[PDB]
Amino acid sequence: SGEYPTVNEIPVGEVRLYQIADGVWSHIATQSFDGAVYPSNGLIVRDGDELLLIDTAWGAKNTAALLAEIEKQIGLPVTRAVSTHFHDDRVGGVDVLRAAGVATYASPSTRRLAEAEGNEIPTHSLEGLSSSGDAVRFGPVELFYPGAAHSTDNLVVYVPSANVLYGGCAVHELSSTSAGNVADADLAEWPTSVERIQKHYPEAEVVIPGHGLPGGLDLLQHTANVVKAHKN
Length: 232
Ligand SMILES: CC(C)c1cccc2c(-c3ccc(CNC(=O)[C@@H](N)CO)c(F)c3)c(C(=O)O)[nH]c12
Ligand SMILES: [Zn+2]
Ligand SMILES: [Zn+2]
Description:
It is classed as antimicrobial protein. Keywords: Complex, metallo-beta-lactamase, inhibitor, zinc, indole carboxylate, antimicrobial protein. This protein is an alpha/beta fold. It has a single domain (7-231), classed as 4-Layer Sandwich (Metallo-beta-lactamase, Chain A). It is 25% helix and 28% strand. Strand 3 and strand 4 (50-54) form a beta hairpin. Helix 5 (190-200) runs antiparallel to helix 6 (218-231). It is globular, with a radius of gyration of 16 Å.
C-alpha cells in the first residue's frame, strides 16, 4: 500500500514495482538460497516508448513474473537489460529475457565470471568499463565501474534525469549490520570504490542498494562503515 515492498508483502512467486522518480522504478523479488530467503532489487528506466531493465529478478520464474508485472503496471516493452555483476541475483533470468526479445548486456568481466560460475550469460559485451572510474552512456543511464567492492566486476548505474544512483550490491541499506554475501568481495578495496562513487555522484538524491530499502547519500558512507567493521 505504498511502503517499500519486503518479503512479507510480496506473494509467493511474485514481483513488485516501486516508483522511485518520474520514469524510474525499482523491482523487488524474493528468492531462497542455502535455505534462507532474501529480497533483491533491480531497476527499470523509461527510454522513450521503451524500457531499460537493470538486473534480473533472481531466477527464471521470478524474471518471467517481472516481465508480466511490467506489462501490467507500465505497459511499455523491455528492449534491453544490463546485469551489474555475475551473481544469480543479477543474471539468473537472462535466458528468460533473451527468449522474450530483450537484448542482454554486461561487461566482459561479468560475462567471463558468469560463464565460469555456471550462471546465465548476457549476450552483449559492454566495453569501456574495464578501469576504475570509467563511465559510459547506455540509453537513459550512465554505467560506472567504481572498482572492486562486492565483486570485482560490479557496476553502478546513474539516472541523470532523476539523480538516482543504483548502487547494486556494492551498496547496502541503512539497516544492514553486515556486509552481506562477501564470498567474491574485495573488503580492502571496497571503501576506496565507494569513495569513487561518492566523488563521481555528489548530487545523487536517491541511492538504491542491491538488497533492501532505498535512501539517500548516507547509504554510501554506511556501506563503507559496515565493510570496514566486517573486515576488522
Ligand atoms: C551470491 C548471491 C546470489 C547471494 C545469495 C544469497 C545471499 C546474498 C546476499 C546478501 C546476504 C545477506 C544480506 C543481509 N543479511 C541477511 O539477510 C541475513 N538474513 C543473513 O545474513 C544481504 F543484504 C544480502 C548478497 C549480497 O550481499 O549482494 N548476495 C547474495
Ligand atoms: Zn552479488
Ligand atoms: Zn547481491
